């Protein structure tokens, strides 16, 4: 998907955008001044149906990461799993291309 | 052999997303929408006006 | 009736939902493009069709997909 | 051609049958085996 | 204009064997998935699946079991492991043992074990073990009930099931069937009445009641009682829907009729819906030539005059290929005092229909004549239609 | 070799089937690995979708 083929996104085919940028949210809390504050918050998986504007937002709980390593890698896998689950949930009529 | 008028691109709400000859098409989304919807209305209105 | 003077003109340049479709029928598809790519090293995936086994899918089928099954 | 045999297999089967007929190979009493093979020429071509 | 091969006519199945190189990529991916913390379970499962498909049936066995052993303790993985070993007995048994020690709470493993074990005694033992571990699993209880040939033990099992699963209906029904007395039925009712049971449980009681088979008029009363006692959820013709299958069994149809009548009465008390009636009619039409539906129609007729219903009744009778006639006779006899008036008012073909039915029934041509005469007498201004048949 | 092997592996398959029946199972196509791409028709036939 490109600047070129953006118009392709709004044909009559069903699609899901999947943002896993915000899955492991770590926070270092900062206001407009810039004070430090260390923490490791809950995360999310943004999944969007730009036809309907449904937003299947899986809220990743922080309990996930307790005693976990290769954390980043794990996150990706988790996201994938979530996506799969979502797909399964969707009926064939509503499922995405 | 004239250029007495000009021919523009006939947008609609299915084109909308795909026309770029006229500007603002993602830039100003709702403005663009207004333009395109407005255009459509005019077309329809023109037809109706003609009928009248 | 004669052949036309072979001149090589590129006048067309068209496109348009309307005109795309038509041409989409003649364009190679994206899966055909994929097929036309064959992975380099590997013994690349063939469908043995009874009339002729010859046929290579090619890189249409994804590596993982290929390893498992069809698409 | 049946749906059972690939032709190689058919051939094999035939051979087996020819061997496995009762006392074909014994010709001590002058027994004569005769394995007539033939095309039916024009058969397809000359159906009424 | 050689056109392009219609994309979706590309070649599909019975492909060449998957390449080692290709497989290795997949393996690597799966390793990454696994090693990047366990899922916990599904990663292993996924790997197993891949192996099965890849294909391979040795590496999977080696690795999947190992995976199962250390970190995870999910039923699903155990199940997968079991599946992987179709090698009939010993390995499977071992797997089961490993599982139930770890996960006794998950029914699936128990079921698998049961499936595995061929001998009936063994199966019974397994079931018992499951029960000891897990109390609530209705299916297991049912299986247990099924297993045995003797009586007392079976009864005991049923009792246990009742104790454990509070609102298993099938089990309750089975128990009821077992004991075989009116006292027993009463006891059962008592046991149940204490329990909260709003929706549709007294149907069982009704069924039990008409095991005697002569009694039947008290059924209606019981039905009436049922809804008033219970703090109920407003429903119409759900009972009928549920009655259907039940009705279809032997010695149940009669019971169903009473229930239907009760329901109708309740509806009347509540108020005339219009849609509900239509729904009921539709239901009746579906699954035709059945007795409960007929009963409903009969009840309706008794309540109020309906020519459509009468036609429907006739149709039902035809489908059946006599009940209607009987009903008519009953109507004439029990209350020709009140019926003559209504009939007279109608001035209808009901009489004609009756006559026709009689004719169909009898070649002896005397009973029919008598009936006709009665009808003539019955009708006070005497109906015109009757005479022609005579 | 193919015809003799076909004869062999179909007998084997039959035996397996019988065993399955005795132990009440649908025949596991996991077991028939080894004698899979052998036989005419192949044992790959029997479990094609």
Short mmCIF file of C-alpha atoms in Angstrom, two decimals, chain E residues 175-376:
data_model
loop_
_atom_site.label_atom_id
_atom_site.label_comp_id
_atom_site.label_asym_id
_atom_site.label_seq_id
_atom_site.Cartn_x
_atom_site.Cartn_y
_atom_site.Cartn_z
CA UNK E 175 -34.36 -40.97 37.31
CA UNK E 176 -38.13 -40.50 37.09
CA UNK E 177 -38.37 -43.32 34.56
CA UNK E 178 -36.35 -45.59 36.83
CA UNK E 179 -38.46 -45.54 40.03
CA UNK E 180 -41.92 -46.45 38.60
CA UNK E 181 -44.54 -45.34 41.18
CA UNK E 182 -46.94 -42.44 41.85
CA UNK E 183 -45.38 -42.12 45.31
CA UNK E 184 -42.00 -41.95 43.58
CA UNK E 185 -43.29 -39.24 41.25
CA UNK E 186 -44.61 -37.27 44.22
CA UNK E 187 -41.24 -37.57 45.95
CA UNK E 188 -39.47 -36.34 42.82
CA UNK E 189 -41.83 -33.37 42.61
CA UNK E 190 -41.16 -32.53 46.25
CA UNK E 191 -37.41 -32.70 45.63
CA UNK E 192 -37.76 -30.41 42.61
CA UNK E 193 -40.29 -27.91 44.05
CA UNK E 194 -37.68 -26.84 46.67
CA UNK E 195 -35.18 -26.21 43.84
CA UNK E 196 -35.58 -23.01 41.76
CA UNK E 197 -37.02 -24.12 38.41
CA UNK E 198 -38.91 -21.41 36.51
CA UNK E 199 -38.85 -22.14 32.75
CA UNK E 200 -40.31 -25.54 31.66
CA UNK E 201 -39.51 -28.32 34.15
CA UNK E 202 -43.06 -29.35 35.24
CA UNK E 203 -43.55 -30.84 31.77
CA UNK E 204 -41.61 -33.82 33.13
CA UNK E 205 -44.02 -34.06 36.05
CA UNK E 206 -46.98 -33.98 33.67
CA UNK E 207 -45.42 -36.74 31.58
CA UNK E 208 -44.89 -38.84 34.70
CA UNK E 209 -48.51 -38.32 35.72
CA UNK E 210 -49.99 -39.86 32.57
CA UNK E 211 -47.76 -42.99 32.75
CA UNK E 212 -50.89 -44.72 34.21
CA UNK E 213 -52.84 -44.33 30.93
CA UNK E 214 -56.60 -44.12 31.57
CA UNK E 215 -56.11 -38.77 35.86
CA UNK E 216 -56.18 -36.98 32.48
CA UNK E 217 -58.49 -34.05 33.47
CA UNK E 218 -56.25 -33.23 36.49
CA UNK E 219 -53.44 -32.67 33.99
CA UNK E 220 -55.11 -29.43 32.93
CA UNK E 221 -55.35 -28.33 36.56
CA UNK E 222 -51.67 -29.11 37.09
CA UNK E 223 -50.77 -27.08 34.00
CA UNK E 224 -52.82 -24.16 35.28
CA UNK E 225 -51.08 -24.36 38.65
CA UNK E 226 -47.59 -24.51 37.15
CA UNK E 227 -47.29 -20.96 35.83
CA UNK E 228 -49.02 -19.24 38.80
CA UNK E 229 -46.62 -20.73 41.38
CA UNK E 230 -43.46 -19.85 39.44
CA UNK E 231 -42.00 -16.34 39.04
CA UNK E 232 -42.16 -16.63 35.27
CA UNK E 233 -40.55 -15.09 32.16
CA UNK E 234 -43.18 -13.96 29.60
CA UNK E 235 -43.18 -16.59 26.79
CA UNK E 236 -45.76 -17.78 24.21
CA UNK E 237 -45.56 -21.06 22.20
CA UNK E 238 -42.03 -21.92 23.43
CA UNK E 239 -43.68 -24.74 25.38
CA UNK E 240 -45.38 -25.93 22.20
CA UNK E 241 -42.05 -25.88 20.36
CA UNK E 242 -40.45 -27.90 23.15
CA UNK E 243 -43.53 -30.11 23.49
CA UNK E 244 -43.19 -31.15 19.85
CA UNK E 245 -40.31 -33.64 20.12
CA UNK E 246 -41.56 -34.80 23.51
CA UNK E 247 -45.06 -35.27 22.09
CA UNK E 248 -43.65 -37.33 19.23
CA UNK E 249 -42.67 -40.06 21.80
CA UNK E 250 -45.14 -42.77 23.01
CA UNK E 251 -47.62 -42.09 25.90
CA UNK E 252 -46.72 -38.34 25.74
CA UNK E 253 -49.06 -36.90 23.12
CA UNK E 254 -52.02 -36.91 25.50
CA UNK E 255 -49.95 -35.16 28.16
CA UNK E 256 -48.86 -32.53 25.64
CA UNK E 257 -52.47 -31.72 24.81
CA UNK E 258 -53.27 -30.78 28.41
CA UNK E 259 -50.17 -28.59 28.57
CA UNK E 260 -51.17 -26.87 25.33
CA UNK E 261 -54.65 -26.22 26.71
CA UNK E 262 -53.17 -24.75 29.88
CA UNK E 263 -50.91 -22.49 27.83
CA UNK E 264 -53.88 -21.31 25.77
CA UNK E 265 -55.82 -20.56 28.95
CA UNK E 266 -52.89 -18.56 30.31
CA UNK E 267 -52.67 -16.59 27.08
CA UNK E 268 -56.39 -15.84 27.24
CA UNK E 269 -56.03 -14.65 30.83
CA UNK E 270 -53.14 -12.39 29.83
CA UNK E 271 -54.90 -11.00 26.72
CA UNK E 272 -55.40 -11.67 23.00
CA UNK E 273 -52.10 -11.08 21.15
CA UNK E 274 -52.96 -11.70 17.45
CA UNK E 275 -49.32 -12.37 16.52
CA UNK E 276 -48.95 -15.18 19.06
CA UNK E 277 -51.91 -17.02 17.55
CA UNK E 278 -50.42 -16.63 14.07
CA UNK E 279 -47.09 -17.98 15.30
CA UNK E 280 -48.85 -20.97 16.86
CA UNK E 281 -50.68 -21.64 13.59
CA UNK E 282 -47.40 -21.48 11.68
CA UNK E 283 -45.82 -23.94 14.11
CA UNK E 284 -48.77 -26.30 13.68
CA UNK E 285 -48.43 -26.08 9.90
CA UNK E 286 -44.74 -27.01 10.25
CA UNK E 287 -44.24 -30.68 11.27
CA UNK E 288 -47.75 -31.58 10.01
CA UNK E 289 -49.91 -34.71 10.53
CA UNK E 290 -49.08 -34.66 14.28
CA UNK E 291 -51.40 -35.00 17.24
CA UNK E 292 -50.35 -32.17 19.53
CA UNK E 293 -50.98 -29.65 16.76
CA UNK E 294 -54.43 -31.17 16.21
CA UNK E 295 -55.15 -30.94 19.94
CA UNK E 296 -54.33 -27.22 19.89
CA UNK E 297 -56.77 -26.67 17.03
CA UNK E 298 -59.44 -28.66 18.87
CA UNK E 299 -58.95 -26.53 21.96
CA UNK E 300 -59.23 -23.36 19.89
CA UNK E 301 -62.45 -24.62 18.32
CA UNK E 302 -63.94 -25.32 21.74
CA UNK E 303 -63.08 -21.80 22.88
CA UNK E 304 -64.45 -20.00 19.82
CA UNK E 305 -65.89 -20.54 16.29
CA UNK E 306 -63.21 -20.85 13.55
CA UNK E 307 -64.00 -22.10 10.02
CA UNK E 308 -60.35 -21.84 8.97
CA UNK E 309 -59.39 -23.99 11.95
CA UNK E 310 -62.04 -26.55 11.00
CA UNK E 311 -60.61 -26.69 7.47
CA UNK E 312 -57.15 -27.05 9.02
CA UNK E 313 -58.44 -29.86 11.24
CA UNK E 314 -59.88 -31.63 8.20
CA UNK E 315 -56.57 -31.27 6.38
CA UNK E 316 -54.72 -32.72 9.37
CA UNK E 317 -57.12 -35.66 9.48
CA UNK E 318 -56.58 -36.29 5.78
CA UNK E 319 -52.82 -36.22 6.28
CA UNK E 320 -53.12 -38.70 9.14
CA UNK E 321 -55.22 -41.04 6.95
CA UNK E 322 -61.44 -40.19 12.98
CA UNK E 323 -60.07 -38.16 15.90
CA UNK E 324 -61.90 -35.14 14.49
CA UNK E 325 -65.11 -37.15 14.27
CA UNK E 326 -64.70 -38.28 17.87
CA UNK E 327 -64.15 -34.68 18.98
CA UNK E 328 -67.28 -33.59 17.12
CA UNK E 329 -69.28 -36.36 18.79
CA UNK E 330 -67.99 -35.29 22.20
CA UNK E 331 -68.98 -31.69 21.48
CA UNK E 332 -72.46 -32.81 20.44
CA UNK E 333 -72.98 -34.95 23.53
CA UNK E 334 -71.25 -33.52 26.65
CA UNK E 335 -72.28 -29.79 26.74
CA UNK E 336 -76.34 -30.36 21.86
CA UNK E 337 -77.62 -28.16 24.74
CA UNK E 338 -75.21 -25.21 24.36
CA UNK E 339 -73.78 -26.31 20.98
CA UNK E 340 -77.12 -26.36 19.15
CA UNK E 341 -77.57 -22.63 19.74
CA UNK E 342 -74.12 -21.62 18.48
CA UNK E 343 -74.38 -24.02 15.54
CA UNK E 344 -77.82 -22.64 14.68
CA UNK E 345 -76.45 -19.10 14.77
CA UNK E 346 -73.60 -20.11 12.47
CA UNK E 347 -75.92 -21.86 9.99
CA UNK E 348 -72.78 -23.57 8.70
CA UNK E 349 -71.38 -26.50 6.73
CA UNK E 350 -69.94 -28.08 9.94
CA UNK E 351 -72.97 -30.37 9.89
CA UNK E 352 -72.36 -31.18 6.22
CA UNK E 353 -68.72 -31.99 6.98
CA UNK E 354 -69.80 -34.28 9.82
CA UNK E 355 -72.24 -36.05 7.52
CA UNK E 356 -69.52 -36.51 4.90
CA UNK E 357 -67.18 -37.96 7.52
CA UNK E 358 -69.88 -40.38 8.65
CA UNK E 359 -70.46 -41.46 5.05
CA UNK E 360 -66.74 -42.05 4.59
CA UNK E 361 -66.64 -44.13 7.76
CA UNK E 362 -69.62 -46.39 7.08
CA UNK E 363 -70.88 -48.47 4.14
CA UNK E 364 -73.76 -49.86 6.29
CA UNK E 365 -75.81 -46.62 5.86
CA UNK E 366 -77.79 -46.73 9.15
CA UNK E 367 -75.51 -45.08 11.71
CA UNK E 368 -75.08 -42.12 9.36
CA UNK E 369 -78.85 -41.86 8.93
CA UNK E 370 -79.30 -41.89 12.71
CA UNK E 371 -76.69 -39.15 13.08
CA UNK E 372 -78.46 -37.06 10.44
CA UNK E 373 -81.77 -37.51 12.25
CA UNK E 374 -80.16 -36.43 15.52
CA UNK E 375 -78.73 -33.34 13.83
CA UNK E 376 -82.15 -32.48 12.41
#
